[PDB]
Design a protein around this ligand. Structure first.
Ligand SMILES: NS(=O)(=O)c1ccc(Nc2nc(OCC3CCCCC3)c3nc[nH]c3n2)cc1
Lengths: 294, 257
């Protein structure tokens, strides 16, 4: 079971457990090993494994095997070479070429559309959880925070999403959130790939809301019906004007700006789905080049 | 909204794959339909005590039927399988699942924490971690979107009838969740409003009153005999104002199909 694997090095530490780079000694396959030391089997692992076994897609990290050994649970994944965050830092002085940004966004939207079509919410999209390889693929990883949803949705966990990528409807405490929260995160990531800095780098929920408001305008009942009634809405909120959207991510041209604005729509009902975004004019010339580095 | 059709299609595929073996109880030497009925009724109690989602109950029952489809279990161990399944279901579905200690308490201390935790492992092994199974509940909430207009009593009555189907393996094990949900929604709709399975759902599901009839005839009888059934926890549960007291409603004498 673990006999055929040779550990290479630690990669890092996600929602729970430890991930190692390892090598299958008989086949030569390089893999990532998620090690869980065993309140019983954690719900995060129960969710991750059950959902990942259903999700078979080129832009979703592939679960290969589940190994129940003495005292430990090992998850065997396809190995990817680098996360998006480390890749953006390596692009500090050259930037990321537009065809690569465009290709990554298109792939992430495919990955997301597949998740949503299979009633799965990821709920933790951020650059550290987006993994790239040498052939130009980008893939969704760390499904520890994911869950299967119903139609229509119930109230789910209110903690969700790393603060910088957290949707307005979560921050304002709506009873219901859904697929739109993953789209919001991707919009923030789209902006980030272009500027190579976080779009809304807040350190508190109120700071996060205000940063969002200063960029997109304080939402009123016209742009987002029901907003003034939401649990965490305060009438004392400063009312910032919506600024020239071309000033939000300056290098972006008309098609890209249009797509970003639809991804960052306040109203979760009006926010573009991953499925609909695949056909946006922005992607008319999309290709799949290899990373320009390493 | 943009994913309703995709999700429904996907759940229709998965309910076939996630389905328990229809004749498994005959192959079990020590347990009966009656013993399983007692188990499911007790799980209802557990769900009521810890304020668990109805979905959690439906998942746990699916885990048990699938486990018992391949694993022979002595009568004295049936409740342990039921307890681990409800623990697993809670972890999958609940925002705040009860702790393991709470599951040990409600088993009257028949089993230890170590037994419950080892049975969790075995259930996960036997089900090969495939826990995202379609349930009657998951189809009902989708069917509810087709009401004109929405009616809380129809919704609760449909959930009540769908829950009763969990108790009796004969005959409900032979029906898929989508079909049971179809019958339950139609029966609730007819009882409350006099309306029938709507055209828009024929369009969505492919089911008609003709294809739903066999399940509907069985569900009608179960509804009629519910106050005289040996297991009563579901009727007690559905007296509460949370579910609009729908178990107090009188069943129709005929369905006129
Ligand atoms: N930092 S890095 O840039 O040096 C680099 C990054 C990630 C990986 N590889 C990799 N990582 C995974 O999860 C690792 C985990 C890290 C913590 C957050 C969630 C992701 C995987 N899960 C399946 N396949 C995986 N492959 C290689 C190099």
């Amino acid at each position: 079971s673990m006999e055929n694997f040779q550990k290479v090095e630690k990669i890092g530490e996600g929602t729970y457990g430890v991930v190692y780079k390892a090598r299958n000694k008989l086949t030569g396959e390089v893999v990532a090993l998620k090690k869980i030391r065993l309140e019983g089997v954690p719900s995060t692992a129960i969710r991750e494994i059950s959902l990942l076994k259903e999700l078979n897609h080129p832009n979703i990290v592939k679960l290969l095997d589940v190994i129940h050994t003495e005292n430990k649970l090992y998850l065997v994944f396809e190995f990817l070479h680098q996360d998006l965050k480390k890749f953006m830092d390596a692009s500090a002085l050259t930037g990321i070429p537009l065809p690569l940004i465009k290709s990554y966004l298109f792939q992430l939207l495919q990955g997301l559309a597949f998740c949503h079509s299979h009633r799965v919410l990821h709920r933790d999209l951020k650059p550290q959880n987006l993994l790239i390889n040498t052939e130009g693929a980008i893939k969704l990883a760390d499904f520890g925070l994911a869950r299967a949803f119903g139609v229509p949705v119930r109230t789910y966990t209110h903690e969700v999403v790393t603060l910088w990528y957290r949707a307005p409807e979560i921050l304002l405490g709506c009873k219901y959130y859904s697929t739109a929260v993953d789209i919001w995160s991707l919009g923030c990531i789209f902006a980030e790939m272009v500027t190579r800095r976080a779009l809304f780098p807040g350190d508190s929920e109120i700071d996060q809301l205000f940063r969002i408001f200063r960029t997109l305008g304080t939402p009123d009942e016209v742009v987002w019906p029901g907003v003034t009634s939401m649990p965490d809405y305060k009438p004392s909120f400063p009312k910032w004007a919506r600024q020239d959207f071309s000033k939000v991510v300056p290098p972006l041209d008309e098609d890209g700006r249009s797509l970003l604005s639809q991804m960052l729509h306040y109203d979760p009902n009006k926010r573009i789905s991953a499925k609909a975004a695949l056909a946006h004019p922005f992607f008319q010339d999309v290709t799949k080049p290899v990373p320009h580095l390493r | 909204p943009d994913y309703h059709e995709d999700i429904h299609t996907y759940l229709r595929e998965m309910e076939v794959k996630c389905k328990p073996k229809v004749g498994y109880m005959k192959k079990q030497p020590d347990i009966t339909n009656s013993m399983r009925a007692i188990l499911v009724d007790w799980l209802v109690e557990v769900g009521e005590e810890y304020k668990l989602q109805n979905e959690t109950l439906h998942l746990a029952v699916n885990y048990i039927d699938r486990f018992l489809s391949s694993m022979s279990v002595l009568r004295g161990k049936l409740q342990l399988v039921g307890t681990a399944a409800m623990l697993l279901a809670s972890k999958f579905e609940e925002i705040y699942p009860p702790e393991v200690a709470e599951f040990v308490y409600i088993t009257d201390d028949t089993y230890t924490k170590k037994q419950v935790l080892r049975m969790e492992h075995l259930v996960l092994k036997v089900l090969t971690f495939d826990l995202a199974a379609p349930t009657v509940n998951q189809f009902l909430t989708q069917y509810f979107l087709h009401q004109q207009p929405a009616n809380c009593k129809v919704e609760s009555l449909a959930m009540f009838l769908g829950e009763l189907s969990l108790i009796d393996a004969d005959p409900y094990l032979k029906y898929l969740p989508s079909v049971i949900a179809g019958a339950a929604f139609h029966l609730a709709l007819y009882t409350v409003t006099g309306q029938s399975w709507p055209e828009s759902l024929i369009r969505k599901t492919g089911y008609t009153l003709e294809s739903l009839k066999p399940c509907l005839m069985d569900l009608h009888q179960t509804y009629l005999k519910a106050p005289q059934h040996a297991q009563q926890s579901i009727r007690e549960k559905y007296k509460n104002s949370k579910y609009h007291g729908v178990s107090l409603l009188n069943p129709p004498e005929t369905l006129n199909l």
